[PDB]
Amino acid sequence: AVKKFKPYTPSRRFMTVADFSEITKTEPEKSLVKPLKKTGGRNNQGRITVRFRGGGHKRLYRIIDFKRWDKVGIPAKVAAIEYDPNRSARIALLHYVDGEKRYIIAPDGLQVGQQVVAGPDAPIQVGNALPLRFIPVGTVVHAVELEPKKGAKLARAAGTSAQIQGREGDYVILRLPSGELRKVHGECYATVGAVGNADHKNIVLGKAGRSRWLGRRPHVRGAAMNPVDHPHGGGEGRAPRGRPPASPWGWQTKGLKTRKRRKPSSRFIIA
Amino acid sequence: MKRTWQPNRRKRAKTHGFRARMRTPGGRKVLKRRRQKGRWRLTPAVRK
RNA sequence: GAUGUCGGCUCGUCGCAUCCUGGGGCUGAAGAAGGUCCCAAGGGUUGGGCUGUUCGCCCAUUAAAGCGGCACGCGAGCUGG
RNA sequence: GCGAAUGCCGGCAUGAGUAACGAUAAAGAGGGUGAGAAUCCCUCUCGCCGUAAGCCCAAGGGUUCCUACGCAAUGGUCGUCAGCGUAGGGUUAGGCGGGACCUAAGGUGAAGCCGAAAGGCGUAGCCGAAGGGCAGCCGGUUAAUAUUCCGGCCCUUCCCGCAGGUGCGAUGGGGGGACGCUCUAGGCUAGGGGGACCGGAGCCAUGGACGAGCCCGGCCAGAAGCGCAGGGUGGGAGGUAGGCAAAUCCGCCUCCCAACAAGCUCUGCGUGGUGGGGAAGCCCGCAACCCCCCGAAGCCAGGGAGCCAAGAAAAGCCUCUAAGCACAACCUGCGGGAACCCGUACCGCAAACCGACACAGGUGGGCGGGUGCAAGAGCACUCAGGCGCGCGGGAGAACCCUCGCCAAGGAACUCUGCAAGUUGGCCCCGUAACUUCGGGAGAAGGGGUGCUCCCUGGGGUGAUGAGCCCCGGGGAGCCGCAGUGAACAGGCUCUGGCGACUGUUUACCAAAAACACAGCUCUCUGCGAACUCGUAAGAGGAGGUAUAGGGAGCGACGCUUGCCCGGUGCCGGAAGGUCAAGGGGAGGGGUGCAAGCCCCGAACCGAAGCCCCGGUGAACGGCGGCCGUAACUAUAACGGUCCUAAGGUAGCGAAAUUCCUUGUCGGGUAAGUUCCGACCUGCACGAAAAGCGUAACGACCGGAGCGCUGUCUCGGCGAGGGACCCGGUGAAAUUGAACUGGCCGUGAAGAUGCGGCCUACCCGUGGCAGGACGAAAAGACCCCGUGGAGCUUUACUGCAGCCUGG
RNA sequence: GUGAGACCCAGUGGAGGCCCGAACCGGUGGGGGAUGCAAACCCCUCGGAUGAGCUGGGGCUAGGAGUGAAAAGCUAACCGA
RNA sequence: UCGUGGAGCCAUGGGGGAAUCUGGGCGGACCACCGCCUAAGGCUAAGUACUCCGGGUGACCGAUAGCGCACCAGUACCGU
RNA sequence: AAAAUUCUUCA
RNA sequence: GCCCGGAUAGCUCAGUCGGUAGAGCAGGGGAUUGAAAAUCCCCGUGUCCUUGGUUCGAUUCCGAGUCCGGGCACCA
RNA sequence: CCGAGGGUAGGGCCCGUGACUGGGGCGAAGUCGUAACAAGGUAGCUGUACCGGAAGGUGCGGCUGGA
RNA sequence: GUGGGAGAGGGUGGUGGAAUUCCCGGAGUAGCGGUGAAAUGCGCAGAUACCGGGAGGAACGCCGAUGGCGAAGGCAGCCACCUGGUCCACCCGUGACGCUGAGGCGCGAAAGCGUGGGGAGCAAACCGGAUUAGAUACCCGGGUAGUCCACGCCCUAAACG
Numbered sequence A: 001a002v003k004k005f006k007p008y009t010p011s012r013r014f015m016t017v018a019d020f021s022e023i024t025k026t027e028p029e030k031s032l033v034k035p036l037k038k039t040g041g042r043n044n045q046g047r048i049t050v051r052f053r054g055g056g057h058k059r060l061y062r063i064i065d066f067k068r069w070d071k072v073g074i075p076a077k078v079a080a081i082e083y084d085p086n087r088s089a090r091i092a093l094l095h096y097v098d099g100e101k102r103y104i105i106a107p108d109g110l111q112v113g114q115q116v117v118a119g120p121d122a123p124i125q126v127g128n129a130l131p132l133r134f135i136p137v138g139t140v141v142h143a144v145e146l147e148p149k150k151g152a153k154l155a156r157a158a159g160t161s162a163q164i165q166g167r168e169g170d171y172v173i174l175r176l177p178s179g180e181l182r183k184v185h186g187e188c189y190a191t192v193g194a195v196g197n198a199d200h201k202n203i204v205l206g207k208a209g210r211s212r213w214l215g216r217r218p219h220v221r222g223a224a225m226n227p228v229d230h231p232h233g234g235g236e237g238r239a240p241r242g243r244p245p246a247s248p249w250g251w252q253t254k255g256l257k258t259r260k261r262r263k264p265s266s267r268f269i270i271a
Numbered sequence B: 001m002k003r004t005w006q007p008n009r010r011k012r013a014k015t016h017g018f019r020a021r022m023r024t025p026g027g028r029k030v031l032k033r034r035r036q037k038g039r040w041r042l043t044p045a046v047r048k
Numbered sequence C: 001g002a003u004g005u006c007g008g009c010u011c012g013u014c015g016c017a018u019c020c021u022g023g024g025g026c027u028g029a030a031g032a033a034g035g036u037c038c039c040a041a042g043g044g045u046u047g048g049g050c051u052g053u054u055c056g057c058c059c060a061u062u063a064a065a066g067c068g069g070c071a072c073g074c075g076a077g078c079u080g081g
Numbered sequence D: 001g002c003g004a005a006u007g008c009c010g011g012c013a014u015g016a017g018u019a020a021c022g023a024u025a026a027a028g029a030g031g032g033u034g035a036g037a038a039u040c041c042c043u044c045u046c047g048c049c050g051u052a053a054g055c056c057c058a059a060g061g062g063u064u065c066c067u068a069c070g071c072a073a074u075g076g077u078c079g080u081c082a083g084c085g086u087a088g089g090g091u092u093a094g095g096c097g098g099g100a101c102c103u104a105a106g107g108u109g110a111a112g113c114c115g116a117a118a119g120g121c122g123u124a125g126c127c128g129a130a131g132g133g134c135a136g137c138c139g140g141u142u143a144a145u146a147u148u149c150c151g152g153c154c155c156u157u158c159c160c161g162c163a164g165g166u167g168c169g170a171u172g173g174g175g176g177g178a179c180g181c182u183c184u185a186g187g188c189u190a191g192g193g194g195g196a197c198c199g200g201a202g203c204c205a206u207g208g209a210c211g212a213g214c215c216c217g218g219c220c221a222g223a224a225g226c227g228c229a230g231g232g233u234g235g236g237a238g239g240u241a242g243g244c245a246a247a248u249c250c251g252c253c254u255c256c257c258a259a260c261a262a263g264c265u266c267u268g269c270g271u272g273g274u275g276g277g278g279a280a281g282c283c284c285g286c287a288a289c290c291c292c293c294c295g296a297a298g299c300c301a302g303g304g305a306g307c308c309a310a311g312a313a314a315a316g317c318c319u320c321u322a323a324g325c326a327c328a329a330c331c332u333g334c335g336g337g338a339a340c341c342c343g344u345a346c347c348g349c350a351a352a353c354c355g356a357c358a359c360a361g362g363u364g365g366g367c368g369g370g371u372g373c374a375a376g377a378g379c380a381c382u383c384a385g386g387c388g389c390g391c392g393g394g395a396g397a398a399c400c401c402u403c404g405c406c407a408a409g410g411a412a413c414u415c416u417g418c419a420a421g422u423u424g425g426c427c428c429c430g431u432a433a434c435u436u437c438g439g440g441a442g443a444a445g446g447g448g449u450g451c452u453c454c455c456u457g458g459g460g461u462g463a464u465g466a467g468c469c470c471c472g473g474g475g476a477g478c479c480g481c482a483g484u485g486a487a488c489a490g491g492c493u494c495u496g497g498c499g500a501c502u503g504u505u506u507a508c509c510a511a512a513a514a515c516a517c518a519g520c521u522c523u524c525u526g527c528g529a530a531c532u533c534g535u536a537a538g539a540g541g542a543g544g545u546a547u548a549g550g551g552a553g554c555g556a557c558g559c560u561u562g563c564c565c566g567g568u569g570c571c572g573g574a575a576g577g578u579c580a581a582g583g584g585g586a587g588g589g590g591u592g593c594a595a596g597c598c599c600c601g602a603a604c605c606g607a608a609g610c611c612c613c614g615g616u617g618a619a620c621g622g623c624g625g626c627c628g629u630a631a632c633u634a635u636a637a638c639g640g641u642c643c644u645a646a647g648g649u650a651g652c653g654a655a656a657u658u659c660c661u662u663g664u665c666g667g668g669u670a671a672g673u674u675c676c677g678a679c680c681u682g683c684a685c686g687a688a689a690a691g692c693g694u695a696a697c698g699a700c701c702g703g704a705g706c707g708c709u710g711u712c713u714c715g716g717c718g719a720g721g722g723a724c725c726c727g728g729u730g731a732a733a734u735u736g737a738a739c740u741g742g743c744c745g746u747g748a749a750g751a752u753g754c755g756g757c758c759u760a761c762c763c764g765u766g767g768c769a770g771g772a773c774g775a776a777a778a779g780a781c782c783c784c785g786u787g788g789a790g791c792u793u794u795a796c797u798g799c800a801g802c803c804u805g806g
Numbered sequence E: 001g002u003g004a005g006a007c008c009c010a011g012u013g014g015a016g017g018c019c020c021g022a023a024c025c026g027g028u029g030g031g032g033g034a035u036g037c038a039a040a041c042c043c044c045u046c047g048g049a050u051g052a053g054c055u056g057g058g059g060c061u062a063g064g065a066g067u068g069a070a071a072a073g074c075u076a077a078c079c080g081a
Numbered sequence F: 001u002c003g004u005g006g007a008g009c010c011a012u013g014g015g016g017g018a019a020u021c022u023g024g025g026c027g028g029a030c031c032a033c034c035g036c037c038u039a040a041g042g043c044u045a046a047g048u049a050c051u052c053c054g055g056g057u058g059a060c061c062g063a064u065a066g067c068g069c070a071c072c073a074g075u076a077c078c079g080u
Numbered sequence G: 001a002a003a004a005u006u007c008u009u010c011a
Numbered sequence H: 001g002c003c004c005g006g007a008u009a010g011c012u013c014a015g016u017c018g019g020u021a022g023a024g025c026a027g028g029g030g031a032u033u034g035a036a037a038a039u040c041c042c043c044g045u046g047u048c049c050u051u052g053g054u055u056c057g058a059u060u061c062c063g064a065g066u067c068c069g070g071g072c073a074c075c076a
Numbered sequence I: 001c002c003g004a005g006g007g008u009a010g011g012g013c014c015c016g017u018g019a020c021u022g023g024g025g026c027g028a029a030g031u032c033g034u035a036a037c038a039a040g041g042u043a044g045c046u047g048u049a050c051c052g053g054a055a056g057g058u059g060c061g062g063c064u065g066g067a
Numbered sequence J: 001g002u003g004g005g006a007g008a009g010g011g012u013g014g015u016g017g018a019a020u021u022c023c024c025g026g027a028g029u030a031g032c033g034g035u036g037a038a039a040u041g042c043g044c045a046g047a048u049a050c051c052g053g054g055a056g057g058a059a060c061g062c063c064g065a066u067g068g069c070g071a072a073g074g075c076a077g078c079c080a081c082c083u084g085g086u087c088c089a090c091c092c093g094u095g096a097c098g099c100u101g102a103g104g105c106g107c108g109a110a111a112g113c114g115u116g117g118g119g120a121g122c123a124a125a126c127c128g129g130a131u132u133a134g135a136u137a138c139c140c141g142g143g144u145a146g147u148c149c150a151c152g153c154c155c156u157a158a159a160c161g
């Protein structure tokens, strides 16, 4: 729902946090599965290549399953729904009848105790992953694969989800979270339902820090630097860019389409 | 106040060490030159 | 191969084309006041409001609140608005 | 062949016996020593520090440590002294810290990938430490070392043997190791305060005291056992699609038993056989070691609760099985043996480290006693302990520095209350507009504070009752000028501008109104993402996936954000126009006696780009002018007309913007180029280079008031550190050479140096700064040079990159 | 309190880029210093001080390159290369 | 020597792609003669260059010269 | 389902 | 103070090449109305600012000037 | 002790006045249009919303006191 | 109370077909549109007109009325669940328990506001084209908020019989 605070301090008036009842249950990550020293670092081999990243609360990583086809047919009981710091969603831990456990970006609705599974036979109900071709046109599904056997890669951010628009050949049409209509293979898996924790889009960082705890360093405007630093830069006291909106690298930044034209990945898109 | 020289044995060697000179083709050419000239010390001498 | 630049402060000193105070001729000078011109700096020539201001404009007085020169006197004396 | 080059190397001058001698914590005397002592040693007075100016440890420094000789130099003076010279000594570890252990970022790097070479990436592995893991505590000794040597008590590994246990057995599997912030409970310990009690040499002074007097000290370590605190922890028995099935171990199902437990374990603290230490005191040598109380930030520890930002790894260590092996082998006991390498002096907030210096600067971790002030690591004094800052002695000018006080006035000072003053703690009353209901608030403005005597209420600890502490409540009364009696310790208010806010910045002239900021919008990006770095491989993005990532502007919040796509940019346009290779060769040329061999080459087919068409403003941007008109005049709701892509809407407005200007009214003032409120002919506001506001916030900028003041009228006195004199040591920039006066002139136009005249015995000391166009910097402005660099763009020309045909 | 609520009182509770205030990190105004104690220091005063905090050790990024809460600041006492 | 030039020759990143002596390259576009030469595999002393090193000479220096060092110098010292 | 504005004052 | 731009019918503004000068609005006269507007027919208008000069001829091309407009005045 | 009152500080209600500013009322014959009364020449009115010289226009819904 | 009845009373979930718009596909060619007449505008880059498939949003034709239900506002496709009011029949039970109702509390068309979503049609403002003396209007071509859903506000009306 999102917690609100009385203004017993500015910023704390505008501040809001996520309701943690969905997760209220198992805060400590499963010592196996999640355990994975996660390496922080805002640059590659030397230089920074994504400005303004850095700092930000120590974060332990949690490995999730983005290809539930591992255990086809093997059902599992959702042991618990915990908080994952490395993502917008909430993951859910689930023990399989097999014994093996693992996390799954918890879908909106899924509840602890519910049984769930993955496969063709699999029943169409929130939490079960199936190959697209076997999923009722129109249903909402998330964590959609994009190419058979290559893992989930679509609609995984809290509250996101794509809708099955129709079949057509070995492919099926999908209106993705952005709204684009892409044809995706039939063998491509996906777990039924929406991502959940849709409230996310409503939390208000509130202060300047918080934005720091998230690991995002202060971002500085082009026109605030100088001729050398940026192209908007310079100008004897405050000025209107100088035309036309560009980036520190010098490419137009208002409307100039960037995706590669000759990309063979077209032919499967429409939006 | 803090002055440019803040002594540290490890740094000094890890940085201008002999082994250090040897790894870089550039440092190799440093020792090359030093020996050439006649320097009594090729590497900034230090001891532990 | 540098003569520090406006204003203020401190310290002055000089010119006279005199703002006072001294003399004196006219007066359309009754007296008192004045106006004007001549002789004369010896000594005087206020405290505030506003502005960085010099300058002025006001306030309250005054015998008068003179004009001007000394690298628009004076930063190896001060201040830097 | 030198006289000049702010020439170069060296030497020596001037300033100059001048400035200065490095914290204003402070000295005095008497003994020694010695050729010679303010300065070295000893004693006695005195002052300074005491979250230290004292102890301990890292880093760094490397003999500075200790002893004996020493004083040329070094030491800002002196020097018998020394961190100095010469010489000799000195650093002892299975347990402390590193290594024959572990992993982190990162490094390196088999494989593997890449790159003209050099090289770049890079899996396992390896390297990598204040992190993990690992066995020593209390004393005693040396001139100098000690958890190292010695004493006492207590341990750890390996190796061998013995005895009893058991499926023993990995580099493999699993568990564990293992983790955040804030707040916390209970016991303890460190530490500290009391004692009428215990042990002591002694002490009655100067009017009093033989006193429950005064003064000193009343602990430390310690196996097993035993206590008191905890911390960890269900056992069962079956199944078993997982732990890249090797497992009786994990993990999942299922079911007898068992639960805010007990037991089992593992630490902490007492206690403990016994060992050790043990003052003030005189000739330098007498021993208790008990009882209360306050009590941690440390310990039990992996305790608890709450929170969102969601909090290393690996080994040791358990456990499971594989090969193998079961004569092994591990396990537990018990004895015997074995136990290497490196460091260990000393300095360590400083004279031994980093600052050329014995430099007022900088330097990480731990302990940091007592009393009083609400508390505290703050403040004053003071323990332990350590210092009096390596030039002194006088004098008592000006002038400067730091500092105290002041009549009357009280901001008149001045750009400005700059500065300094006032105010200042705690307790209680009592507190406005406005407001986002939090705040404003410590608003303002007040009263209280000492000591003594009585009465009185809770609490902890005991034991409910004494003490010992811990919070109060009500009376009487005493003395001062004054009761946080010293020290530490906001001046308050009203009203504007800017920015919401805490925050960041020009290390070394700018801390702001600038940057950032949550938040708003635009745009890109469907994942081998876009974007960035790289020739590449690869990496970041991100072990993310449109509620996500990149770029851009605005910048909390409230009310809002208008018109114009003509030009420009971007977006969309399968048509057209133009269009490069290349395709195609109508037709023509060179040659050959020829077949030929060689060249040119028109139609047409030929991309992207451009042209063209249409969209687009929280995309670059733009957002008018002149005449006329109302029944007093004025003014002009109304009319006309030129021009445009379209003519500035709301709001605001002589403003961080207004030139004319001190606009013009009004407020404030005795008086107001500033300020506040208005007006609007806005030179030249205006809506996300956002417009207008706004509670709160600000070492931000403006205007006023009250309070208090040496800011001032207007200065005076006083203190200390210098200045001055004497003794010691002794620089500097500058300097053509000097025997260096005024005025009126003259002179390259501002003369000590020419002319004329006027002054003026020779030489210093303390002062003042008018001149020597004083010093300092080959002017930073200016211009010049076909000098240079940084930056811009619809300058030129290229290149990366991106698009594109073949 | 109501039908149930919301909401309202006390008490407990201990949040926060909250407040005073050291240590600590800074560097506001004024004074001194200016051949200094010092190639940025000292004095009085002042900002923050549970956070976008400060700090030790071990690492990585660099010359048209890095880094930058943005000053063309810093990159070993002078950085438009 | 060759800066697109009438630009051959010798190399060669890309595309196409032969023949074995009636073969094949060259003689400055290109043809025709005439003549030279044998590609797509390799080796090869000497004459030549240099002076760390040893010697000999000097209308070379003679301690501010001559090497940066005549001397315990790539030292002291400065700098991470 | 309609092209189309107006009528000084006092009586 | 310098460099720019105009001016033409009553008004707002077109145009020229050296021969010609215009439009809209206004206005004058009829028409519709009961009467005004509107609307409908008819109509007239120019020293092309003054000014000298050129030319065969100037609103137009030069030279001077008046007016009304806009734009610069920087380094200090 | 209390105490008239005076002093200092902070609040509350109230009346007057103020550059300037907003509408309002009233005043024979000024200006611009003509919204309403006859489908008032787009039926009228109406709540709210935005826009315009001005009546007023348009949106959405409602009424008939319109057909 | 017992037993029966009618209803667009209300809330939630699901669902149907027609139509408009857009998208793809086919087929087709010189206009379509719109009006009082026109023009703007869409169209040879292939529109209008016709067919097939798909998307999505809003509203439910006929039934349907001068009808029904609700306290009022208001409420209409179908289905299911949850739920209020109401009428008749039987005279069974209670035994005046009633009426009204300042204040309070709740509901309350449309428009408007907030947070997010949704967006086909329509459509203030706005932009064009006409009409006009002018035309910030009536007409035409576009067009944003809004209209839509959820949650929270607003609380007015010719909320009228």
Ligand SMILES: NC[C@@H]1O[C@H](O[C@H]2[C@@H](O)[C@H](O[C@@H]3[C@@H](O)[C@H](N)C[C@H](N)[C@H]3O[C@H]3O[C@H](CO)[C@@H](O)[C@H](O)[C@H]3N)O[C@@H]2CO)[C@H](N)[C@@H](O)[C@@H]1O
Residues within 6 Å of the ligand: I027, I030
């Ligand atoms: N009537 C007064 C109120 O204001 C308006 O009315 C005011 C004006 O509109 C009106 O003006 C009229 C004008 O419309 C009409 N065409 C011409 C007339 N001469 C004017 O009249 C007005 O001015 C004149 C002087 O000039 C006075 O003598 C006369 O009393 C006065 N009413 O005069 C009124 C002033 O009183 C409203 N229309 C009216 O409904 C309202 O009630």
Ligand SMILES: [Mg+2]
Residues within 6 Å of the ligand: A219, A220, A221
């Ligand atoms: Mg920014």
Ligand SMILES: [Mg+2]
Residues within 6 Å of the ligand: A224, A225, A226, A234
């Ligand atoms: Mg800037």
Ligand SMILES: [Mg+2]
Residues within 6 Å of the ligand: A231, A232, A243, A244, A246
């Ligand atoms: Mg640009």
Ligand SMILES: [Mg+2]
Residues within 6 Å of the ligand: A227, A228, A230, A231
């Ligand atoms: Mg640029």
Ligand SMILES: [Mg+2]
Residues within 6 Å of the ligand: A231, A232, A233, A234, A235, A239, A240, A241, A242, A243
């Ligand atoms: Mg710019």
Ligand SMILES: [Mg+2]
Residues within 6 Å of the ligand: A236, A237, A238
């Ligand atoms: Mg500007």
Ligand SMILES: [Mg+2]
Residues within 6 Å of the ligand: none
């Ligand atoms: Mg140095």
Ligand SMILES: [Mg+2]
Residues within 6 Å of the ligand: B008, B009, B010
């Ligand atoms: Mg080290």
Ligand SMILES: [Mg+2]
Residues within 6 Å of the ligand: B012, B013, B016, B017, B018, B043, B044, B045, B046
């Ligand atoms: Mg070394």
Ligand SMILES: [Mg+2]
Residues within 6 Å of the ligand: none
């Ligand atoms: Mg000179």
Ligand SMILES: [Mg+2]
Residues within 6 Å of the ligand: C041
């Ligand atoms: Mg005089």
Ligand SMILES: [Mg+2]
Residues within 6 Å of the ligand: none
């Ligand atoms: Mg004078």
Ligand SMILES: [Mg+2]
Residues within 6 Å of the ligand: C072
């Ligand atoms: Mg002067």
Ligand SMILES: [Mg+2]
Residues within 6 Å of the ligand: C075
């Ligand atoms: Mg000066």
Ligand SMILES: [Mg+2]
Residues within 6 Å of the ligand: none
């Ligand atoms: Mg002078």
